[PDB]
Every structure is written in C-alpha cells, then in structure tokens.
C-alpha cells in the first residue's frame, strides 16, 4: 500500500536517495545533457525544474543561495545557475527540462534508459519525434474540415 | 621443404597471344601469321619437335579439338577423374570450382569453321599451343534444386574462343592438356544471369556521412 | 518439503509452454525515416541518437582542453562553431568552442 | 449481356499483355540506382521490361515492400507494379513523407476507380449503368467522386441509407480480395476497342490520347473490372482499410442524360483514423463536391 | 556427436522439367557450441517460427535476452548464404520454416555448500538450428467456424454403425 506517495525508494535509504539525485542534478547543470536509468532520470526531473525556480529568485536571495549551495556539490556551477541558466529561462514558467527514452542499455542488465537535458542548450539537437506534416492524407482531410467549420460560422 | 614440390603445369601463359581485332569473320591470313612469326614460334615448334618428333601443326587441331569436346562433356557426368587427364591443374579449378552443387548440360553442335593453330611458345621445359575454335554450343546450369540459373535449355549459339594447350615436354608421361583460354577485348559480352542482382552501396557507421 | 514424485515431461511441457510463459510479439517496431534503421515508436532511434552523442563527445572533449582543469566552468553562455563560421554580434561575449570538422547538416 | 463485355474486354486486355510481353526477346539488364535517403547508393541490376519497382523493394527488405506506395523513376511517379523500361534512378514514396502530394493523388484515384467497379455490379442486370467519368478532385474537397448515368427507369429513384450501406459492403469485399492494380500503357486503337460501347469513355480516351504526342493511354484493371486512369495507382486494394460511400447527388443540369455523382471517403492502413474523427469526416463527405 | 544439419545444404536435386512448379530453395544453418541453456533458447527459437526473415529480425532486435543476439547473428548469416550460395533472388523473400534448440556437450564443475557438502553444477551449452525456405510465410492459422464444427459433428453421427451384430 504505497498510495499517494510521490517518491521512489532508491539507494541505501532516504538520505542516499537525495545524494544519488544530487549527483545527477550536479552533472545535469554542468553538462546540460545526462544519461541515467529512466526511473532515476524521472526522479531527478522534478528537482531539476525546481532548481531553476530558485535560480530565478535571484543572486541576493539567501534561501536560494543555500539551496544552490546544497544541491550543486561542484561550487563553480553555482555562478552558472544564477547567471546562465536562470537568465535563459526567464520567459518560461516551467518545462525547462526535456526527457526522452533511449534504447535499452547494452550492458547485460538491460536497464531502461533516458536522456535528460535542459532546454536551450548548446549541444547538438536530439533526434526528437517529429509529427507528420499537414500535407499527409489524414491531415489534409482534417484541414478541409477545419476550413469549412471556420468559414461557415 | 626437404622434397621439392612437383609442378606438371605452370600458371599463366608464357606470352599472351593478342588476337587481331575483327578476327571473328568469314565464319590463309592467320595461317600466314604463324608463318610470319616463325622466328618467334617456329623455333618453339622446332624445340617441340626434338622432344616429341611427331608434332605437326596440320594434325594438331583435330586432336586439339577432340580434347576440347571431351573435356567439357565430363562436366555433364561430373567425371573429375577423366577430366584431370584432359586438362592441366591450372585449368581444372577454373572449370569446376563454381560448378559444385550444380548440374550443367553442355553439348557441341557442328563446328562453323576449321580449327587452326595460331601461336605457340616454349619456356623444366613447357610448350604451349594456342588454338582458335569457332563452334556452336549449348549450355544450361541448374541449382541444387534443379531450377535453371543460366543459359537456354536447348538453343545453339556460335562461340569464338582461343584455347591454350600445354604439355610437359621433359616428363615421359606428359601429355597435351587444356590449359587456358585467351579472351579478346573486342569480344561481345556474354549472356547475363537470368535472375536480378542487388549491388550493395557503401555501409556507413553513425560517425560517417554519405557522399 | 521435498518432491514426493518425479514430474513427467508431459506435465512439465504444459508448464513451460503455457502462453503466460511465452515471449510476446511486439507491435510497436517501426523503421526510422532519416536513417532507415529499426526503432520503437515511443523510443528514440538508436542509430540517429548514436550520431548525436558521438558528436557531443567530440564537442565536450574540445571543451575540456580549453578549460584545462576542474572547477573552470564559465559564468557565461557557451556556443559551438565549426570551420568556416565566425561569431555574430549576438555571439559577442560567449565562450566559443571550435571544431575542426564542418558544420553537420542536421546540426544547425 | 454484361457478362459478355467483361469476357471480351478481359480477352483484349490479356492479348495486349502477351503481345508486349512477347515483344521483348531474351533478357537485357538495366542498372537502376537507389537515390533515396535511406540505404543510399544501392544499385539494382534488373531485367528490362519485366522487373518492377516492387521487385527492387523486395531486394532491400520487407519494410520497403509494405510501406512503399509509389516510386519516383527519373523524377516521375511510377506504379509499383509497372515494369521498368530503362536505366534510371529510383526512389520510393510512402504515405508519411514530408510532402506526399503525389502519393495522395494516386490513393485518391485508385479509391475512385474502386467506386466505379462497385457501382457497375451493384445494380440489377435489367438496368443499364454507364460510367461517364471520374472527376479529378483535390483531397481537400473531402471525398473522391465518380460520375455515373443510370437507366431512365430509375430517373427519380434515390438510394436510401441501407442502399448506401450496401455499396460499402461491396467495397469492403473488394478490399478483402486484395487485388493488385494491374497497369497497361496501350495505344488508342486497343483502348477504343475495349471501350467502344461506352460513348463517354470513348471521348475521354480521345482526349487523353491527343494530350500525349503518341496515342498511349493508361489502362488499369482490378480483377475483371477495367478502366481508364488519369495516372499511377495504388499497388493493391489491401491498402485501403476504412471505406465509405457517403452519398449520391444528382447533377441538376442533366436533363438530356441524368448524371449522378457518387461520393465516398477512404483512408489507408498506414493512416487510420479514430472512431469519432472518422465519423466527422464522413459527415463532411456527404456534401456536394465541385471539381476545381 | 553428429553434425547432419550442416550436410543438408549439400543435397542436389536433378534438373526440373519444364512442366513442373518451381521448387522453393531451402537453406540449413546452425551455430553449435553456444554458452546458453537450450531451455532458455527454446523460447526465442519458438517465437520466430513461421515468421518472415525481416519480421524475425525486427522482433529479435528489441528482445533483452542474451540468446536473441545469437539467433539474430545466425539468421543474418543464413540470409547471406541463401543469396550468395543457394540462388535465392531476394533477401526479403524468406521465412523461418524450422527453428529449434538442442543440447550441447556440457562441463561438470563443483557447487560449494555450507558444511563441506557440495553439488555437481553443469556449465550448459546448446545448439541452434534454422531452415530458411524461399517464399512468403505460409498463411496464418484459420480457426474453425461454427459451421465447420457442426459439419464434423454430423459426420460423426453418420459414421455410426450397428455394433456387434450382423
Ligand atoms: Mg506510486
Ligand atoms: Mg560459498
Ligand atoms: Mg542439473
Ligand atoms: Zn534514426
């Protein structure tokens, strides 16, 4: 009976879970694109989004600095969070991270894998799933339906 | 190797005779040409006479023709034992290597024109005689499963080929055996395989890009 | 508790060939438009993804040389330029990573 | 009798096939190069006038066979089952291409032809049904249209809902048969002979023959049914999955000969539609279509 | 040990006469000493039975089992020799007629236990066999209709005879 609980049980315990997640978050901020097991990447996605919000609060905020200090073990990253990532995501209200499933791991444990990144990074674009064009057969028929309904009141 | 390896034939042709463009006609001339190159080739004939003494260009084409017909007919029966006597060790793998697990039906239709010796050479000592053959033949090759993959069951097509025979003059038990065929550049292309082929393009790893 | 009788191959064949124990056939396998290799509908193409990361490693390798040591992350945005490209006015005051190869067609 | 026309028309169709098949003696090899994005550079050594683009797809893999609806031979759309004629570069088109304009037309034309086949055999042999034309309508119109002239006896009978439902049942039967769309490029003379009785078809053949420098006219056959075509068609009738004969509308200026336009919608297996989406599209396919 | 599966590719039939259906090609291939349980390999071999070559490869590429890659590699080798050596025209025109696993020669080792007791462990090997038959996969299985079931029942009734009498 684990109804309503919003966390995975990871690592050696609750504290170990935080540290495992913290290490992934630290890697994500530095490199902006990280591969982990799909479950662990999903666990860390929420923290990645909330960290940007703390960065938006501002450099001078004391709580933001303490939060940034705890989560970014490599302390050179803290300037990056407040002066690079937060300015980038000023317009958005959320959805800063992009997470997609990668083919399973070829390492005899066949782990389910994911790629987690921050949006807007400098790295080569991921091969995202592109929806079909309006020129396809089904789309054109729907486009015809849309035009008639809009034009005819 | 303590014992020297024994070779009864030599791979290749000592001097590859170049057929004259247009020779495939009127199906003299080439008869004169062997006379014309007598210095290069008659001397070879003279040496062949010494070790043989019964080598007459007049009668060799008949014997040379006979070997050609019989050698191929072994392919139908697949009598490799006979065929080894008829052809040299250089010729044998070329004829038979790709016919394994296949059945070939080959027959000889009447010869269009008389066979003629066209070029001979000598080198312990080997003597090679090139002969010119124009003949109509039939060929059909099948799969393991009996399905036809090449040729037409029974239609005669005229063939002009130049076949090199060879003999080991020194050996007492040597004989004239089919050795090689010289293909002229001007020859028309042979019939294509019945089936259709895919020639794969370059395979590229993720790093690479097509060009 | 230990077995009271040997289990016959007739019983055993019913256990290990029951449909519940068989490998399910997958209906979500599709071919990738760009590379022409196989993929699952909900999963990224592994061939195309393989291209992206190996280019990423090349970029990150160049980054390591420029920084030269740990704890040298910039406080300014980063940008990658390939041979034949020069920083624009908007590119002013941003770390530039230089790559010997030409700009990949897919990368823009 | 109508059965006789099917027999005689089929005989002429087969006679032309053998004549062209016999026309090519021996085997001549044509090199056709794959120019598509995937598997680039592959060269298919095919036989002239016998092999088809489907055979090239067979060499590569089953994905090409299942997903390829059309081929681009030297920049022109070709039927998958139309024998290749000369050395060229070939590319395979699918329904999910970024701009599948040519594929959409071929699917639309084929579905219209399937409508004609159903109509001919639907009515009782007592009445006389004559196929006039299949107007070329944009896919945006929302339905494919086939024009037909029924007997004067039915000059004021209109199909009911059950009658229209009956038509779709025949169409689905055609799909289940999985009949390949045979292709012939034939000179006017033979096409006119096959379609001598139908005045409407005859004039259409004349137009489509004058258009080309020679008298070549495209003929396509589904089973026994035969028809003239505006261009390339789908490989097989199994491509269609959802099919509907939406409605029939009488063309008002048809006093000399009452022409009734038949309308329907279809979608391939590759692009299926959800239940609700299909219903809404079907409703919009029951409205008149004006060729533009 | 016996190695008859390899020999089957050497059978040569006589030329077919003009009035006869074209014989489909058959290719036999195997990989012998595979470090993998035959019981485990059966499931992978079972799944691809009857499928086309491309369909079998697609399913194997996305299976997480160790044996899937082994079977896939064998299937690709079988495909190449079919076209290269057995006069198969189209690579795609192939289906899995037979696919099964057999026991290999195994090695006996010692499994240590708690109190100086031991057990005999087996280092298991297995073989994998396939036959590829040219042509589309045979049509799938069609279940009996209700009318077919009724017809069989009536035949049983009509077969009844008066038993143990003249
Ligand atoms: Mg939960
Ligand atoms: Mg122990
Ligand atoms: Mg045991
Ligand atoms: Zn891809």
Curated annotation (Swiss-Prot), chain A:
Q: Write out the entry's keywords from A to Z.
A: Mitochondrion, Ribonucleoprotein, Ribosomal protein, Transit peptide
Q: What subcellular compartments does it reside in?
A: Mitochondrion
Question: What is the name attached to this protein's record?
Answer: Large ribosomal subunit protein bL17m
Q: Name one GO biological process term.
A: translation
- An annotated Gene Ontology molecular function: protein domain specific binding
Provide the gene name from the record.
Mrpl17
Give the Pfam families listed for this entry: Ribosomal_L17
Single GO cellular component annotation?
Answer: mitochondrial large ribosomal subunit
- Assembly behavior: Component of the mitochondrial ribosome large subunit (39S) which comprises a 16S rRNA and about 50 distinct proteins.
Superkingdom of the organism of origin: Eukaryota
| Family under the similarity heading | Belongs to the bacterial ribosomal protein bL17 family.
Q: Does the keyword Transit peptide apply?
A: yes
UniProtKB/Swiss-Prot annotation, chain B:
Q: What is its main location?
A: mitochondrion
Superkingdom of source: Eukaryota
Q: Which residues cross the membrane?
A: none
The GO cellular component terms are: mitochondrial inner membrane; mitochondrial large ribosomal subunit; mitochondrion
* Protein keywords: Mitochondrion, Ribonucleoprotein, Ribosomal protein, Transit peptide
Which Gene Ontology molecular-function terms are recorded? structural constituent of ribosome
Q: Which family does it belong to?
A: Belongs to the mitochondrion-specific ribosomal protein mL45 family.
**Function of this protein?**
Component of the mitochondrial large ribosomal subunit (mt-LSU). Within the mitochondrial ribosomes, required to direct the nascent polypeptide toward the tunnel exit and position the exit at a distance from the membrane surface.
Q: What is this protein called?
A: Large ribosomal subunit protein mL45
**Species assigned in the record:** Mus musculus
Taxon lineage = Eukaryota, Metazoa, Chordata, Craniata, Vertebrata
Coverage span on the entire protein: 72 to 294 of 306
From Swiss-Prot, chain D:
Q: Which UniProt keywords apply?
A: Acetylation, Mitochondrion, Ribonucleoprotein, Ribosomal protein
Question: Mainly resides where?
Answer: mitochondrion
InterPro entries associated with the record = Beta-grasp_dom_sf, Pro-tRNA_synthetase, TGS, TGS-like, Thr/Ala-tRNA-synth_IIc_edit
Cystine crosslinks:
none
Compartments annotated for it: namely: Mitochondrion
N6-acetyllysine modification, residue list: 91
Ranges for domain TGS: 28-94
Question: In this entry, which stretches build a coiled coil?
Answer: none
Recorded family membership: Belongs to the mitochondrion-specific ribosomal protein mL39 family.
Give the quaternary structure: Component of the mitochondrial ribosome large subunit (39S) which comprises a 16S rRNA and about 50 distinct proteins.
The protein, known as: Large ribosomal subunit protein mL39
Species of origin? Mus musculus (Mouse)
Swiss-Prot record, chain E:
What processes in GO biological process is this protein linked to?
A: mitochondrial translation
Q: Where in the cell is it found?
A: Mitochondrion
Recite the UniProt keywords alphabetically: Mitochondrion, Ribonucleoprotein, Ribosomal protein, Transit peptide
The Gene Ontology CC terms held by the record are: mitochondrial inner membrane; mitochondrial large ribosomal subunit; mitochondrion
A Gene Ontology molecular-function term? structural constituent of ribosome
Q: Does the keyword Cytoplasm apply?
A: no
Keyword Ribosomal protein listed: yes
Q: What is its main location?
A: mitochondrion
Q: How does it assemble?
A: Component of the mitochondrial ribosome large subunit (39S) which comprises a 16S rRNA and about 50 distinct proteins.
Stated family:
Belongs to the universal ribosomal protein uL22 family.
Q: What is this protein called?
A: Large ribosomal subunit protein uL22m
Could you tell me which species this protein originates from? Mus musculus (Mouse)
Gene coding for it: Mrpl22
> Which part of the full protein does this chain span, and how long is the full protein?
41 to 206 of 206
């Amino acid at each position: 009976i684990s109804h309503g609980r919003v966390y995975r049980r990871l690592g050696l315990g609750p504290e170990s879970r935080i540290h495992l997640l913290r290490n992934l978050l630290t890697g994500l901020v530095r490199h902006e694109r990280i591969e982990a097991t799909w479950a662990r990447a999903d666990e860390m996605r929420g923290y990645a989004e909330k960290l940007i919000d703390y960065g938006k609060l501002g450099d001078t905020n004391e709580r933001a600095m303490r939060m940034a200090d705890f989560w970014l073990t490599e302390k050179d990253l803290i300037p990056k969070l407040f002066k690079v990532l937060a300015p980038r995501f000023q317009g958005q209200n959320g959805n800063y991270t992009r997470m997609l499933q990668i083919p399973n791991r070829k390492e005899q444990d066949r782990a389910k894998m994911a790629v987690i990144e921050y949006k807007g990074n400098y790295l080569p674009p991921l091969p995202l799933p592109h929806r079909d064009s309006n020129l396809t057969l089904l789309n054109q028929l729907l486009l015809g339906l849309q035009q008639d309904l809009h034009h005819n009141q | 190797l303590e014992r020297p390896i024994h070779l009864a034939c030599t791979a290749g042709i000592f001097d590859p005779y170049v057929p004259p463009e247009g020779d495939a006609r009127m199906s003299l001339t080439q008869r004169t040409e062997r006379l014309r190159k007598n210095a290069a080739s008659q001397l070879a004939i003279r040496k062949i006479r010494e070790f043989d003494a019964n080598f007459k260009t007049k009668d060799f084409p008949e014997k040379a023709k006979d070997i050609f017909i019989e050698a191929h007919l072994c392919l139908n029966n697949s009598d490799h034992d006979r065929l080894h006597t008829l052809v040299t060790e250089h010729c044998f793998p070329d004829m038979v290597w790709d016919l394994k697990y296949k059945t070939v039906r080959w027959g000889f239709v009447e010869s269009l024109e008389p066979a003629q010796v066209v070029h001979v050479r000598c080198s312990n000592m080997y003597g090679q005689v090139t002969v010119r053959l124009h003949t109509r033949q039939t060929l059909a090759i099948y799969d393991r499963f009996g399905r036809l993959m090449y040729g037409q069951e029974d239609v005669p097509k005229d063939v002009l080929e130049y076949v090199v025979f060879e003999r080991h003059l020194m050996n007492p038990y040597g004989s004239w055996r089919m050795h090689a065929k010289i293909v002229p550049a001007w020859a028309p292309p042979k019939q294509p395989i019945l089936k259709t082929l895919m020639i794969p393009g370059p395979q590229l790893k993720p790093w690479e890009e097509y060009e | 508790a230990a077995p009271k009788n040997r289990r016959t191959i007739e019983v055993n064949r019913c256990r290990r060939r029951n449909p519940q124990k068989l490998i399910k056939i997958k209906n979500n396998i599709d071919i990738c438009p760009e590379c022409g290799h196989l993929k699952q509908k909900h999963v990224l193409c592994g061939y195309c993804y393989e291209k992206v990361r190996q280019e990423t490693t090349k970029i990150r390798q160049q980054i390591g040389a420029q920084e030269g040591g740990p704890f040298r992350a910039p406080s300014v945005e980063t940008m990658v330029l390939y041979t034949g490209e020069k920083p624009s006015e908007k590119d002013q005051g941003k770390r530039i990573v230089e790559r010997n190869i030409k700009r990949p067609s897919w990368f823009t | 009798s109508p059965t006789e026309l099917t027999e005689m028309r089929n005989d002429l169709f087969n006679r032309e096939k053998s004549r062209q098949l016999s026309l090519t003696p021996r085997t001549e090899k044509i090199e056709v190069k794959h120019v598509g994005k995937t598997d680039p550079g592959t060269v298919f050594v095919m036989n002239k006038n016998i092999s088809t683009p489907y055979s090239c797809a067979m060499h590569l893999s089953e994905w090409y066979c299942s997903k390829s609806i059309l081929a681009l031979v030297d920049g022109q759309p070709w039927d998958m089952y139309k024998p290749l004629t000369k050395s060229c570069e070939i590319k395979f088109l699918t329904f999910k291409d970024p701009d599948p304009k040519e594929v959409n037309k071929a699917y639309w034309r084929s579905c219209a032809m399937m409508l004609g086949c159903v109509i001919e055999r639907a009515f009782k042999d007592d009445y006389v049904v004559s196929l006039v034309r299949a107007p070329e309508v944009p896919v945006i119109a929302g339905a494919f249209c086939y024009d037909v002239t029924l007997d004067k006896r039915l000059d004021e009978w209109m199909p009911t809902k059950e009658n229209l439902r009956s038509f779709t049942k025949d169409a689905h039967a055609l799909i289940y048969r999985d009949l390949p769309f045979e292709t012939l490029d034939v000179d006017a003379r033979v096409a006119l002979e096959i379609f001598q009785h139908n005045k409407y078809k005859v004039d259409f053949i004349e137009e489509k023959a004058s258009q080309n420098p020679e008298r070549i006219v495209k003929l396509h056959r589904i089973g026994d049914f035969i028809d003239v075509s505006e261009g390339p068609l789908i490989p097989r009738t199994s491509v269609c999955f959802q099919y509907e004969v939406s409605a029939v509308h009488n063309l008002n200026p048809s006093q000399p000969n009452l022409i009734r336009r038949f309308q329907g919608l279809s979608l391939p297996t590759h692009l299926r539609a959800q239940f609700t989406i299909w219903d809404k599209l079907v409703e919009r396919s029951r409205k008149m279509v004006t060729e533009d | 040990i016996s190695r008859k599966w390899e020999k089957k590719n050497k059978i040569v039939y006589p030329p077919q006469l003009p009035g006869e259906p074209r014989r489909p090609a058959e290719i036999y291939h195997c990989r012998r000493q595979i470090k993998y349980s035959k019981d485990k390999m059966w499931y992978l071999a079972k799944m691809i039975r009857g499928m086309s070559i491309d369909q079998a490869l697609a399913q194997l590429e996305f299976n997480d089992k160790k044996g899937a890659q082994i079977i896939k590699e064998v299937l690709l080798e079988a495909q190449d020799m079919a076209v290269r050596d057995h006069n198969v025209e189209f690579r795609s025109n192939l289906h899995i007629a037979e696919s099964t696993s057999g026991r290999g020669q195994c090695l006996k080792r010692i499994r240590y236990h708690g109190r100086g007791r031991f057990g005999i462990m087996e280092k298991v090997y297995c073989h994998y066999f396939v036959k590829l038959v040219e042509g589309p996969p045979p049509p799938p299985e069609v279940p009996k209709t209700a009318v077919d079931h009724a017809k069989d029942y009536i035949q049983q009734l009509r077969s009844r005879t008066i038993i143990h009498t003249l």
